[model samples]
Target chain A: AYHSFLVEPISCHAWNKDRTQIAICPNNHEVHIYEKSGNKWVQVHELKEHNGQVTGIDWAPDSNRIVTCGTDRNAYVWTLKGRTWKPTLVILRINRAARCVRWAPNEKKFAVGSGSRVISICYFEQENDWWVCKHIKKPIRSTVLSLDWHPNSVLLAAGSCDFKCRIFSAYIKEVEERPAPTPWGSKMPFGELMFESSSSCGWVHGVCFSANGSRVAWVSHDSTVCLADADKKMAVATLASETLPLLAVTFITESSLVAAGHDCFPVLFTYDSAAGKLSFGGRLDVPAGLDSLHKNSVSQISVLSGGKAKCSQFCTTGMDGGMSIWDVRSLESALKDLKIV
Target chain B: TATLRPYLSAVRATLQAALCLENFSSQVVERHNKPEVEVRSSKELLLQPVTISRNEKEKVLIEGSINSVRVSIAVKQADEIEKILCHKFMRFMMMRAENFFILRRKPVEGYDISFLITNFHTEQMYKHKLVDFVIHFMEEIDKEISEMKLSVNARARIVAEEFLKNF
Candidate 1:
């Protein structure tokens, strides 16, 4: 089969509800939903309300709703109602621009990471039929680059520009002026100051917990990918080099291996945790001289979820307005030609 | 015994080639099953079928299941002959199936030609060899298209002899 979709250059993209629809946030501050037609991807909806470039987008666990935040300092919730994207809420009056947004696995709550270094945890207060947003502060001077909801529904981890990664309890409730209860009170939520790299190093662009939430993989600008034990205190340097700035990293399985890629050439390294080593499993050379392939660097990579049918497949999106689907096992010409069928 | 060693090695090499082809096919089948596309079957005819069987005389037989063909002829001899043959066969099969195309005019040192033939046929020449054989087989069959020439058993013997002679 061939890739049959051509989306406009997007700053960020995410799949909605079983990957049947893809939400792309372009620089024009609009979010577009494209559904997979026979062999072509057709635009189904256009959310043109945000006033600034959309910074982050994510789908709820149930896949019925979508959450997006932008530099306009606002976060909007859209739900698929009767086959249409309808805005459910318009969150306003934030301290700073919301740079990234993610949905908690529980589907009842979601989180947004902002440039102000505060993560706003909002849960659906079913009784009032409205949403309540609470700001959680990170104890460091860093712009939160990205955030991911823990699979277990109890923890949230945020990657920051200040070269540190922090995990916060997903279920914490903010008590009033009572000294904020030490941030890590009685049930002191699990947190770790991971990857103490030098200041000159680039920010950890992406952070992901394994399927079982037993391990974490972090990608940094220094072209290094570190895999740390979720239950232990030590970190294992899975891979490092200058060939590509490891922009995105994700584990296909809890202990099997970790796959990562960068901006230009797509290099896939399979990590063997049992042997504590990494090997060059596959490489996809972006067609030489294609303006779109080289114009924008790849921003994120995610393994599509489903059964074993899609077990080894991964998708990557670049700044150049192109999203390519790849199979980690077949590194040779298994690229989905996104431009033409 | 010396003569038998080469035959045993040849059998080992052939088996190795079959394994390599199996691996390559599995990987390709997996890629086609990615989430973005809808290709679900994992059947590809790229390598000859290979199997192993005991021979009453000096040689044994290896068959290829995927390709539906008998791949190699191994000689049973001394333990040393069996060991060397197995080692050489595996190496030959791996190199041929994985890195095909080049014609090795001179055989590597310490390796006999028959054993090398198993390696070369299983790995390097299986796909190419089948293509060439089908072209000739089809041409010959078309010439006598409707004529009742060779019986099924006779045709099978001819194909087996040809495989043993070359592979």
Candidate 2:
């Protein structure tokens, strides 16, 4: 893995379709889009739609649309036309700041979590030629911190400061056809609560769905990682005693996970279905007894080389204003019997 | 003394974890971001306060929240003169909290000095470097107060001798 500093800490980042460009919030209200130019990154565009610090950004690889949310209590969908990008603001209708956003797999909509204790599932309305949102409000007691979309594009997984993680049906009949039911549930009504689990210790900082959308993993502020398997009677496995609490997590492979935060380095965790256990695999960032590449905690991870099912490489940006690209294949020796292929 | 090593280590480790703060907007206020530790508006945002003590007179309290942390230190004061000197020194520093950046304008109850570290401070500065500063401050404060106490006693002795000679 190699790393470079960007002068300002990145609150969140997203890659364009071909990975040739990226959108990042440099700890401020503006989102800067930079295209790779030889060995340097040159600014190709600047997005200044939000009045407060931009909290999240996600680019739809297929649709080429960028969704950004911010502390200004708003979200914007940017579509590139010719040489410039134009913004289509989405009315979140919440009173507090939006914390995180994720585009659905099918690119029909996106989900935004906010400090107002709700998740706004937003979809484009052709009749009005703008974006509208449906709120998921009940049972959420505090600020929503993180959100992830199921591969089906109709299910959403959200983690909140209320110490709970939930799966909700985000189906909207106007945008697409009915979603097929999975092991989680058969009902597909919007905002239908399918499942909920309490962390029992701390706020859930990050949540992620498996490639198949059958399992969910979340990291909390109490230095523990949890896995809730939809097929295994909804049983949860909580892995504990990390040196520091994890702020973000990503699934590299179907069973392999990478999480990093206050530890300043990424550690791998693997889940075994037969044993119904999730255990520590190994460290992926730095070798034992060595200094971390970043001076501060890592906050976000994005898949680069492959899809969520089998990611061969990924990128991480942190509070240290540094970004690193890691090839999981090269770290095979770190974990015995672990291989990307 | 020998106890100082472990005391400092405990404080260092606790701080490294407690300093893991992020930018969290207030859930209670509209379009506002405030340090949750200072606001104390929500109970779920706060963490259990941890206190590490080297002795009865010297200890440190770390109160951590989602977006900030408050560190209060009680420097050793063995005598009445030492206490007075410590109070004066802390006041002298607290009066210039802006320049100090992390220093609190006033100490918390029962603590001689206090420092408030927020997510903004960590964002502009290196998180590990900030932790190092707090640890260094804890170590240097004891030596600083003792040095002042020695100088004060020496001055008092000289004044007493001079006054007796006149009598």
Candidate 3:
């Protein structure tokens, strides 16, 4: 009964709060919002604000807004206006391409990563009536490829081409309360480097936080998946895949993760909070290849649900033109067969 | 027994491993993208590059990026005739580069022949079959050139023998 759809080479994707519609940019300038209609995705609306290819699209669940950034050095926050979407431009102030964007939990602000070595933490300015940005511009030597926010909406994790992944306190007191001392650090302030880790791979593709925000994981171009506890101690559980480089990773929980990239299917990995390390769990989405010789690289992976108690599952968006849904229970079974349990 | 099979297999394996490309948007220029090896934009996207050699003079350099890979081959051209044959053959193939989708219009410096495989090509065809074509090309090119060289030598001998008889 499980199936995949025909939207191929999805550069970026975001699901609506109810999961009925999905906003995806097909490695191009326009974002297509597709509505599910009985085993088919019907084109509902097109968000065509950017002059350049859209690089990132983030749908804020509570705010019900979509923030899209593009290589044209611009970002637009789209709000449903009557029957259509209206776009409001954010003054990013960076001359280079904007690489990625993520909304905070509170939807108070969002962080935009760019090729200009700046992470623009943007918030709506009531005075100016537009999105104004506060630039976090120190210590980053190159392009910022990806960013992730802590649940508190205060900490920002940036993965840059300079081989560094940084955790910064993006707390803006103007919008939100002083974030409680996070496991990342204590002093809640704007633009403070709470933690820094250099990836020898240099090109960190994905940086993510755990469900409770107590752990951090990043995948790099050197085929390494690294897990670091917000807690302490460094054996630095880094697993270097012998296969190919991983492009994205997601923490399903404090203990579970699914990372995928050039290797088509997403591989499961579990983190030991006490050991400060990661272990191979197994591969998810193996059945897609079991039926067909077609192996498509997974461009991004995300958790549908966070735990075993629920019908925990994950989804992988592929370059080969389909989104594959996989179950965590089957992943665990594969792990058992490999004796990794 | 020659080690040509092993060398070809090695290239096959490495190509299989490195060929998992994607449609990576250009990080350097806004709204513009090309094969990274051709444009040489964004150093981070280009990989470390793998070189597989049959010997010192005959090797293939496979340089990959997020969206494309550039494969430059140094054919086993031991003599002037072989070199000429290799150059002419590559030019003949590259002249109609459109037909040979992955054939590069120009080879890289110091390489006799080159192929630029992009994400689009992978999408249009089977990735493994593409690798198979590449392996098949390598296996045949050597034999083709050698066979041509043999015919040329035979023709030269016949011409000389005929002329000497006239003398």
On DockQ, the candidate that comes out on top is: 2
DockQ of each: 0.01, 0.65, 0.41
The CA lDDT at A330 in model 3 is 68
Model 3 C-alpha lDDT per residue in residues A140-242, reported as the tens digit of each score: 8777888988888998888987777788889888887867777676896789998888555547889987767777788887778887776673235788777
TM-score of chain A of 1: 0.81
Candidate with top TM-score is 2
Q: Kindly report the docking quality category of candidate 1.
A: incorrect
lDDT of 2 by residue, A1-341 (tens): 55454766888999998899988888888988888888887888999889999998999999899999999999999999999889988999999999999999999989999999999999998997889989999888899999999899998999999899899998888888789879998887999998899656689989999889999999999999988999998899888955899989978777878888888888888898888888987677655132987667799987897777888788888887788888777777555665431
lDDT string for model 1 (A119-151, tens) is: 787766667777777667646454577787656
Per-candidate TM vs. native? Answer: 0.57, 0.96, 0.89
Model 3 ranges off by over 4 Å: A1-8, A233-235, A287-294, A307-311, A330-341, B20-46, B78-80, B119-127, B150-167
Candidate 3 lDDT over residue span B1-167, tens digit each: 29788899999988877686755555666546678767876776678888999888889899877678888888888899999998899899999999988998999998988998999887655677788888899879989999999999999999999999997
Clashes of each: 17, 0, 1
- Runs of candidate 2 with Cα error greater than 4 angstroms are A287-290, A333-341, B158-167
- What local lDDT score does residue A287 receive in model 1, on the 0 to 100 scale? 43
Q: What's the best-to-worst order under DockQ?
A: 2, 3, 1
